[PDB]
Amino acid sequence: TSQVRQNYHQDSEKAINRQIRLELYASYVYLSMSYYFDRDDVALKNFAKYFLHQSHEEREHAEKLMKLQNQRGGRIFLQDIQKPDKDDWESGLRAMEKALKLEKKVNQSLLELHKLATKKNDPHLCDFIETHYLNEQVKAIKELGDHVTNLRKMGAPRSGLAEYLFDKHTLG
Amino acid sequence: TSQVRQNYHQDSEKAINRQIRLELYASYVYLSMSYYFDRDDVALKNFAKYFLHQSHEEREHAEKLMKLQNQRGGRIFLQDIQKPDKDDWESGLRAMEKALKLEKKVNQSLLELHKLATKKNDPHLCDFIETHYLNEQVKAIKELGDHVTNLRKMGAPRSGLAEYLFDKHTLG
Amino acid sequence: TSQVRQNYHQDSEKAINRQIRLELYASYVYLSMSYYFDRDDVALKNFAKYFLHQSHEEREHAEKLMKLQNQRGGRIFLQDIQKPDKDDWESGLRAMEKALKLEKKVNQSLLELHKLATKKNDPHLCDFIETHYLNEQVKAIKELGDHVTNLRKMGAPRSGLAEYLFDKHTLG
Amino acid sequence: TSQVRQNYHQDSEKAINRQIRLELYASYVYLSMSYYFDRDDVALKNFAKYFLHQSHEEREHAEKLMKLQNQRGGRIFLQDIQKPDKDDWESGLRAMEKALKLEKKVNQSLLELHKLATKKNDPHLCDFIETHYLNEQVKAIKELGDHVTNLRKMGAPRSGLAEYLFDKHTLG
Amino acid sequence: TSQVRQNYHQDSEKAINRQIRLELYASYVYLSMSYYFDRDDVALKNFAKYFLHQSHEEREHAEKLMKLQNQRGGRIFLQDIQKPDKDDWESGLRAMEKALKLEKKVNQSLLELHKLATKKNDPHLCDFIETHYLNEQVKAIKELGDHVTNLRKMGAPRSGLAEYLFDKHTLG
Amino acid sequence: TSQVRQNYHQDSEKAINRQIRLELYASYVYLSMSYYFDRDDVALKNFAKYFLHQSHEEREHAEKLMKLQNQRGGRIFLQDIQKPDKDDWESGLRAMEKALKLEKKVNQSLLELHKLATKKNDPHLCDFIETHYLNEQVKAIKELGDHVTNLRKMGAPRSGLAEYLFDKHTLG
Ligand SMILES: [Cl-]
Ligand SMILES: [Fe+3]
Ligand SMILES: [Fe+3]
Ligand SMILES: [Fe+3]
Ligand SMILES: [Fe+3]
Ligand SMILES: [Fe+3]
Ligand SMILES: [Fe+3]
Ligand SMILES: [Fe+3]
Ligand SMILES: [Mg+2]
Ligand SMILES: [Mg+2]
Ligand SMILES: [Mg+2]
Ligand SMILES: [Mg+2]
Ligand SMILES: [Mg+2]
Ligand SMILES: [Mg+2]
Ligand SMILES: [Mg+2]
Ligand SMILES: [Mg+2]
């Protein structure tokens, strides 16, 4: 047992490892999206920049969990980061819709982790999740919803004009 | 066929996808290493910082390859990123030795890429590898070799004093 | 034989003169395109600026080749610069498509030049072409391909709105 | 007919196209001269710089005429730019004498254009020529005459010392 | 075998040692030239400064190769630096002509080294030579040729006036 | 006989040429030492910097002697510069010990030079040696002796920790 460890259930430790993996997977999905928009036959540079930004943000989310794991005296165990579920993300709209689905899946995982921390009476872990993760997720989900809505109302994905103008005026 | 594609062999395109995966793997190994040194029972903060910087550098190496693949009209295909070979890296000296081994393995892959690019008469790809990768690897390998040497000469890994003092005076 | 000449094959010398002529031709093509967009019945001021900038760049590419010819002791022989293929470049999309074609034609010449320099074991010439020309072409080809893609997806050339909006938000 | 066209005679339009061609030819002559002085066996760097500057100015002279042609609603038609009359310009003095002859030829064409514009009662064209071109030519011709005189009085082109010192003290 | 060494042929190692020696010899030749022009009976202070500058530059060229040798895990082995072939360099012109011959001999050595690196499939070493040495040599050879030409056209070495004025206006 | 030559004995002129050679040899020994410490299997970056600085200082010592030889109307005669006695300098302590031996050998030569200058009643040469050389040698010898002492007292060369810590705290 680590000399620092106090009130840290083994189930919470294991669950924090799994959340690290999910954050690293989200980072990889956004990286994939980014370079899809960088293709010569897609060529939406601000979609590309948006998703790259989100990729680097997810890596930071993973690093903060790795730091937490050590702070609490848990031990990090890593698994493979699986490839994202698509290679070609089809359109600006479809990518935003898949990102929305991703952020809601990551939110679900974090809500399950909070419920576990609550059952194990771990208020430090509860506060960590609330402070650094839950409102970050709500804001992300709201932002992505707003983007999806505007893309649909403008005529995407059938209007390539709509995606071009969105790239310029929202993501630019 | 991409409208930009010119003098870009399918075999070179596949090889660049393999190298992307390898750079992402290297990023992941260094990330693992970094947080091993952040453990309370290891506690070498500048080893941790050093390897986190290397992890962010490798992600940049991968991103630049993704950018190249698109510039030449190839198509990115991402794969699962393998977990690192170790969970516990044993000591500062052992980590630096495994990092040296990793960087030589990445260099060998790049040298094989370059041989392929030469066989396919792709001078743009040869210059890209040379300019951005090969000297970066040579400098990394020399630096890691210097660190291993210092750590051995100081008495690591037996001497925990050695690793402490190297963390402060070389890495900090 | 010039006092400075060393390892510079006569075939290389002639090839450099051919490449000088092609770069001056490319400069003239872009000049032509630029002032087409300046017509009152076309009136896309940022397309005009974009192509004028490209014209001046190609002049610089020509001058650098003339400097190289003298550096290596070869002798410059200029020829008539042929007029561009078109007087009227039809639309912003069609001009971009023709520019893409021209930049791939220029690249193919450069790659043939590099092949010749490789066969003649002229690594200074190889490095010159790699350093100053090949990535410049790859970047120009990628940029033009992105521009074509955007104009197509926006609905050009039929939509004069697409070209107006692209002129403002991409080129301006 | 262009919507902007007013008091602009088809004979003036054609004369403007011929003048564009002549300004581009002059640009090419001076480019040739410049890189002759860059040869290792000539090696007068300030003669080389002087003539490159002049080459770039002539391109600007062409560009301003192209802008004029579109301002008036004429249509630019470009032609082949013929190679200069010499490959080797013999000496600094002989290059300056040829440049003097070129600038008089250019002036004679501009004077013929002015006479046509006068005959066709085109005061805007008359003023454009007078404002932008006629005094620029008078100044160029006077400078070149001054330079030829100096070189002759210093003892060129037999005195390689003459041309060296002129390169330093007048063109430097 | 050094722990850093990878893809570095023993013949390339030995050849890099020999190039270190040639760079140090070039440094010594320029040092000799410099202080010849410092003599009271020669007294061309800017020739003296020019060659001293070139001497210190050659030492830097040697140091960069010694660093390369270590980077690649080769071992430096030094031999005597032979005295330059003259004690009295006769004139400004004759010294520039001998410097031209020296730089072409150093260029030949570097081209032979590149051909060896190519045969041994060592693209890192090829890139090192191209990036740091080959264009440096071309520029040096061109500069020296230009100096020789001007000195000859001005009347050197029989005109001491010519050498004095060159000292002042070119090398000053 | 030089027009500047006054009270300058042929024997003093020859002795100054011998001292030039010796200073150039000292520069070369320190250059060797510097890059021994840059090896991956030695890896003491501040020993390397220290000895490279000393090498550049010795070249300055040689240049100043060359300047003196010309000031007094003597004639410089350069000789082959002998390779250093060792290729592998063994350890930081052993290098500093050999550097101490080298500086005492240079000092002995300067003391012999001064004795000669005194015998020939050359007070200008005596003052030159005193002002520029003798105290420089005394300070070098004392510094090297201090370094050797520290390294021995710390436990070098057995203790690789000692040389590491001296590199950081004294030399860095
Ligand atoms: Cl300490
Ligand atoms: Fe996240
Ligand atoms: Fe990498
Ligand atoms: Fe070009
Ligand atoms: Fe003009
Ligand atoms: Fe050199
Ligand atoms: Fe000394
Ligand atoms: Fe300390
Ligand atoms: Mg709270
Ligand atoms: Mg790195
Ligand atoms: Mg361009
Ligand atoms: Mg190559
Ligand atoms: Mg002019
Ligand atoms: Mg290169
Ligand atoms: Mg010293
Ligand atoms: Mg005294």
Swiss-Prot record, chains A, B, C, D, E, F:
Reported effect, E23A: Reduces iron binding and oxidation rate
Entry keywords, A to Z: Acetylation, Cytoplasm, Cytoplasmic vesicle, Iron, Iron storage, Lysosome, Metal-binding, Neurodegeneration, Oxidoreductase, Phosphoprotein
GO biological process, one term: negative regulation of ferroptosis
Transmembrane segments: none
Keyword Metal-binding in annotation: yes
Limits of the Ferritin-like diiron domain: 6-155
EC number: 1.16.3.1
Top EC group: oxidoreductase
GO molecular function: ferric iron binding; ferrous iron binding; ferroxidase activity; identical protein binding; iron ion binding; iron ion sequestering activity
Entry-linked PROSITE patterns: FERRITIN_1, FERRITIN_2, FERRITIN_LIKE
Major subcellular location class: cytoplasm
Catalytic activity line of the entry: 4 Fe(2+) + O2 + 4 H(+) = 4 Fe(3+) + 2 H2O
GO cellular component: autolysosome; autophagosome; cytoplasm; cytosol; extracellular exosome; extracellular region; ferritin complex; ficolin-1-rich granule lumen
Site positions for Essential for association with cargo receptor NCOA4: R18
SUPFAM superfamilies, sorted: Ferritin-like (SSF47240)
Subcellular location: Cytoplasm; Lysosome; Cytoplasmic vesicle, Autophagosome
Residues annotated for Fe cation 2 binding in this entry: E58, E103, Q137
Tissue: Expressed in the liver.
Role of this protein: Stores iron in a soluble, non-toxic, readily available form. Important for iron homeostasis. Has ferroxidase activity. Iron is taken up in the ferrous form and deposited as ferric hydroxides after oxidation. Also plays a role in delivery of iron to cells. Mediates iron uptake in capsule cells of the developing kidney. Delivery to lysosomes is mediated by the cargo receptor NCOA4 for autophagic degradation and release of iron.
Similarity annotation: Belongs to the ferritin family.
Protein name: Ferritin heavy chain
Native organism taxonomy: Eukaryota, Metazoa, Chordata, Craniata, Vertebrata
Gene field: FTH1
